[PDB]
Write a protein that binds this ligand. Structure first.
Ligand SMILES: Nc1nc2c(c(=O)[nH]1)N[C@H]1C(S)=C(S)[C@@H](COP(=O)(O)OP(=O)(O)OC[C@H]3O[C@@H](n4cnc5c(=O)[nH]c(N)nc54)[C@H](O)[C@@H]3O)O[C@H]1N2
Ligand SMILES: Nc1nc2c(c(=O)[nH]1)N[C@H]1C(S)=C(S)[C@@H](COP(=O)(O)OP(=O)(O)OC[C@H]3O[C@@H](n4cnc5c(=O)[nH]c(N)nc54)[C@H](O)[C@@H]3O)O[C@H]1N2
Ligand SMILES: [Mo]
Ligand SMILES: [O]
Length: 771
């Protein structure tokens, strides 16, 4: 009559209370250091009226499958169909593309975060089906570190951003200063790719409790800065390279840089110093020069230099500052600065590029790691067609176009079919109006979705998918500690006519005659036992005993491992520092590449051989009369991107039923805007409505609109107005540079005005037309 079921999500292990077959409460299965409200809305996710309840097809698509008026996408009426008919239609439409163009005509990169779980990984299951039927065009990189993950291999010989960090125990014991540079961990570590072990936030609180210095360098006084009682250094968005250069110049000018470290562990510093001192362009990159650009007073720049060089300092760089034009320069320069400080490889010293993401630094436990489903079941030349994924709109609009990327050339393919399963590009991709046009080009657009997202509303065929709570699965506490195996026990039966993505793709696999290769003859629970036994065997090899799967599953509790002393004491780059000749980096020199011949020899206009300041098209430094404010689009506290936007958590932040925009009181007063007013934000790309949140917690001249609000266009006969405040309606869709071609949202300027009139009803969380 009343039971508690343990399952999990990106936002942690979750206990779910079921009362007479209905979910009535959800919360942490393991008490966290800071409450995580994301864990409390399982019932909202299960029973929401925004859920896709039945297979649906666009009316105009039904009239002429694969030959419709595609300008009707997003505008049409929806027809309920049976699963039989929808699956026959999907199979037929994909087969037509394969028959006429082959695998290069299908895009199934399907970027998204979907839900955690080893088996029910909607994106992987889609790609497993696509590969079982001949292949598909995928993508390269990701939206999180599109720039940093390309430049760091050139500088450090490794991807760096998704690797274990120096142990938090070492930071607690030895760091005098931690600098949160474009990092908001008390927001961004409420989730992990698997399931957050919740220990990263705890360690930040332990460091706060030590009383040692925490510095936040950010255009906003973030949730982290406020909750950790930290020192706020306001900085203009996209001006961190000038600030780092000013700090670097001060170090040289005062003889505080570590010349011994630079000599032994880096390559090309001299070429960089010539630029730093103004010997190549005639402009020394002084603190006074930097202050004009980044808004940090020159004397504050100098004191940071002195404090960093005299105290054991860990530079924790987040990723907002590389999600922008020339983003490659920021973490390149951060590494360069850390090299000049000379503390890389010391306890509590150096830099880290994942202390803000998925609990980096939490000591790695000794245990086992479960398996998971792959896209490889057991003529396809799509590898050459993969492109940097943020070029998606460019690809759909310009088939055959060639671009430069990381020293090579890529030719866009000719995409006829788009299948998304577990992502929301009409919220996550930049310049939404251009994406609308791009999605008119494919012959067929298919979406598996839990809810009626803006992406589903732009499709031809929408298939209802289940949540994690309607199926069984396994995940880990992570993403680096690997300290627990979390069970994901089914809480309720599938709702409405929703199906697990697994079952959707089994049915399509049957229609193509590849069911056996897809399922491998296994049931849901047989898949999970196999994944579990992979961890069982690895734990055994590590001298750790685990219960049998059936015992583990019956207990329905997290199974946790312990970290040993080696993990608790581990220092990143410690071996390199001990002996760089015997422990070289995977770079051409074997050292830190402050100057990279490889990058220089590419001869790109927007990326030189060493870190440099290159003014972007739009930022605080070149706002105009027409667009006098700069924009930054940080990640939200009460959503995972667009996930949970439809839940009761919306009431915790919506202002006048719009996404809130942080605006400085001086910029608000100049516009007659008071707290709580609906405002109109517009750029050269589009216009959205938001709710004014007037606050000194944002640097003057800049406004912050969090990413992830559901695009809700108001069609009034054109770049229609978003009624809800989707940030990417406003952003530029362009590569960071020819090196990485990452996405560049956070270099943007806008205008804001008080909205006069009656506020449009927000309709994007309700069933669409003709359900
Ligand atoms: N202006 C700006 N834009 C940005 C960013 C920014 O910082 N500023 N950040 C970028 C980055 S780092 C990210 S990773 C992206 C996020 O981009 P997305 O990953 O697309 O955002 P999500 O809201 O997580 O979308 C996940 C979708 O998967 C669905 N889903 C969940 N579980 C399942 C399932 O089991 N089956 C199926 N079929 N669907 C499921 C959810 O309903 C949800 O719609 O945004 C990027 N865009
Ligand atoms: N609750 C929640 N947690 C999450 C996510 C979520 O959507 N919701 N997204 C997850 C995923 S997919 C990702 S990739 C990571 C994102 O990890 P991050 O990229 O670090 O998340 P952002 O909010 O974009 O972090 C940028 C922070 O630095 C600021 N900032 C932005 N641009 C600049 C700049 O140019 N210079 C300086 N000095 N500061 C800048 C932002 O205001 C913001 O406070 O977080 C993950 N964790
Ligand atoms: Mo991300
Ligand atoms: O990501």
């Amino acid at each position: 009559e009343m039971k508690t079921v343990v399952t999990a999500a990106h936002w942690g292990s979750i206990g779910v209370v079921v009362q007479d077959g209905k979910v009535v409460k959800s919360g942490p299965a393991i008490e966290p250091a800071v409450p995580n409200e994301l864990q409390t809305v399982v019932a909202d996710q299960l029973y929401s009226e925004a859920r896709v309840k039945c297979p649906m097809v666009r009316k105009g698509f039904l009239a002429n499958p694969g030959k419709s008026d595609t300008t009707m996408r997003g505008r049409d009426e929806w027809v309920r169909v049976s699963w039989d008919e929808a699956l026959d239609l999907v199979h037929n439409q994909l087969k037509r593309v394969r028959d006429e163009h082959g695998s290069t005509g299908i895009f199934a990169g399907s970027y998204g975060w979907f839900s955690c779980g080893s088996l029910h990984a909607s994106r992987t299951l889609l790609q497993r089906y696509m590969n079982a039927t001949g292949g598909f065009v995928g993508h390269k990189g990701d939206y999180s570190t599109g720039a940093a993950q390309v430049i760091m291999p050139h500088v450090l010989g490794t991807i760096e951003v998704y690797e274990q960090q120096t142990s938090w125990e070492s930071i607690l014991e030895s760091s005098d200063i931690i600098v949160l540079w474009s990092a908001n961990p008390l927001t961004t570590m409420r989730i992990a790719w698997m399931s957050t072990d919740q220990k990263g936030i705890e360690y930040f609180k332990k460091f706060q409790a030590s009383g040692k210095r925490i510095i936040c360098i950010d255009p906003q006084k973030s949730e982290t800065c406020q909750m950790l009682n930290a020192e706020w250094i306001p900085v203009n968005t996209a001006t961190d390279v000038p600030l780092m250069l000013g700090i670097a110049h001060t170090l040289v000018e005062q003889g505080k840089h570590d010349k011994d470290f630079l000599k032994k562990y880096t390559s090309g510093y001299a070429k960089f110093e010539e630029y730093l001192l103004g010997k190549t362009d005639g402009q020394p990159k002084t603190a006074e020069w930097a202050a004009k650009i980044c808004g940090v007073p020159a004397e504050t720049i100098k004191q940071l230099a002195a404090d960093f060089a005299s105290k054991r300092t860990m530079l924790m760089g987040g990723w907002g500052m590389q999600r922008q034009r020339h983003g490659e320069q920021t973490h390149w320069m951060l590494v360069t600065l850390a090299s000049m400080l000379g503390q890389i490889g010391l306890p509590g010293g150096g830099f880290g590029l994942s202390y803000h993401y998925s609990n980096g630094g939490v000591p790695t436990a000794t245990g086992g790691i479960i398996g998971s489903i792959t896209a490889s079941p057991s003529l396809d030349d799509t590898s050459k067609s993969a492109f940097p994924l943020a070029r998606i709109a460019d690809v759909l609009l310009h088939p055959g176009k060639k671009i430069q990327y990381n020293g090579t050339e890529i030719t866009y393919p000719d995409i006829k079919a788009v299948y998304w399963a577990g992502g929301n590009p009409f919220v996550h991709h930049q310049d939404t109006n251009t994406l609308v046009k791009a999605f008119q080009k494919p012959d067929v657009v298919i979406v598996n979705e839990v809810n009626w997202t803006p992406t589903a509303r732009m499709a031809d065929i929408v298939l209802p998918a289940t949540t994690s709570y309607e199926r069984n699965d396994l995940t880990m506490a992570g993403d680096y500690s690997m300290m627990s195996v979390y069970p994901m026990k089914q809480v309720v039966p599938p709702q409405f006519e929703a199906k697990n993505d697994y079952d959707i793709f089994v049915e399509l696999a049957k229609r193509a005659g590849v069911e056996e290769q897809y399922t491998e003859g296994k049931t849901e629970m047989e898949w999970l036992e196999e994944f579990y036994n992979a961890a069982f065997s690895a734990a055994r090899a590590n001298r750790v005993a685990m219960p049998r799967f059936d015992k583990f599953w019956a207990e329905n509790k997290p199974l946790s491992f312990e970290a040993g002393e080696a993990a608790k004491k581990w220092v990143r780059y410690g071996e390199f520092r001990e002996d760089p000749l015997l422990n070289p980096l995977g770079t051409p020199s074997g050292k830190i590449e402050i100057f990279s011949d490889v990058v220089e020899k590419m001869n790109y206009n927007d990326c030189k051989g060493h870190p440099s300041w290159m003014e972007p098209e739009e930022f605080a430094g070149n706002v105009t009369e027409e667009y006098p404010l700069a924009l930054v689009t940080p990640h939200p506290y009460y959503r995972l991107h667009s996930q949970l936007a439809h839940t009761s958590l919306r009431q915790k932040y919506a202002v006048n039923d719009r996404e809130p925009v942080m605006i400085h009181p001086e910029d608000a007063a100049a516009r007659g805007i008071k707290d709580g007013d609906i405002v109109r934000i517009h750029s050269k790309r589009g216009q959205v409505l938001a709710g004014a949140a007037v606050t000194e917690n944002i640097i003057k001249g800049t406004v912050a609109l969090h990413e992830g609000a559901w695009y809700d266009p108001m069609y009034l006969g054109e770049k229609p107005l978003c009624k809800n405040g989707c940030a990417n309606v406003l952003t530029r869709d362009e590569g960071t540079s020819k090196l990485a071609q990452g996405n560049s949202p956070n270099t943007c300027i806008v205008q804001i005005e008080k909205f006069i009139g009656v506020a449009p009803e927000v309709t994007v969380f309700k069933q669409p037309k003709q359900v």
